[PDB]
Amino acid sequence: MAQTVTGDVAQTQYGPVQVRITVAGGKITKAEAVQAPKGGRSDQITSASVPRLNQAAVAAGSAEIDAVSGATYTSAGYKKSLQSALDKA
């Protein structure tokens, strides 16, 4: 069974983060931020951080992933949204 699930939007101090994943036989095979902080240096931080989070979500198969340093708000919002996705099953 393969399925795509979108997690709840996490409000952060720098704006919304929202993660979507494909799970296939349970494991994460695709990860993306549907929403991420934008505007000003938040673009730089988003650019920096979310591709790394995405990669770490696909490698982890779980929301037990490490916060990106210097992007702790975005990372915390990413994991909450990703955990939300996993919980939807």
Numbering used by the authors: 1 to 89
From the manuscript:
Herein, we describe the biochemical and structural characterization of two multi-FMN-containing covalent flavoproteins, SaFMN3 from Streptomyces azureus and CbFMN4 from Clostridiaceae bacterium. Recently, Méheust et al. discovered by sequence analysis a multitude of sequences of extracytosolic proteins predicted to contain multiple covalently bound FMN molecules. The crystal structures were elucidated, which confirmed that the flavin cofactor is covalently attached to a threonine.
The second domain of SaFMN3 (SaFMN3-D2, residues 157–244) and the first domain of CbFMN4 (CbFMN4-D1, residues 26–109) could be overexpressed as soluble proteins. The SaFMN3-D2 (9.4 kDa) structural organization consists of three β-strands forming an anti-parallel sheet (residues 2–6, 18–24 and 27–35), followed by two α-helices (residues 41–60 and 72–87) connected by a loop. Most prominent is the hydrophobic stacking interaction of Tyr14 on the si-face of the isoalloxazine and Ile45 on its re-face. Furthermore, hydrogen bonds are located between the O2 of FMN and the backbone amides of Tyr73 and Thr74, the N3 with the Thr74-Oγ1, and the N5 with the Oγ of Ser42. The phosphate group of the FMN is clearly covalently attached to the Oγ1 of Thr72, which is located at the start of the last α-helix. The structure of SaFMN3-D2 shows that FMN closely interacts with the side chains of Tyr14, Ile45, and Tyr73. Especially the benzylic moiety of the isoalloxazine is sandwiched between Ile45 and Tyr14, which may lead to quenching of fluorescence. The highest fluorescence quantum yield among all mutants was 0.07 for SaFMN3-D2-Tyr14Ala/Tyr73Ala and SaFMN3-D2-Tyr14Ala/Tyr73Ala/Ile45Ala. These data suggest that the Tyr14 and Tyr73 side chains have a fluorescence quenching effect on the bound FMN. When inspecting the crystal structure of the SaFMN3-D2, no clear binding pocket next to the isoalloxazine moiety can be identified that could bind an organic substrate.
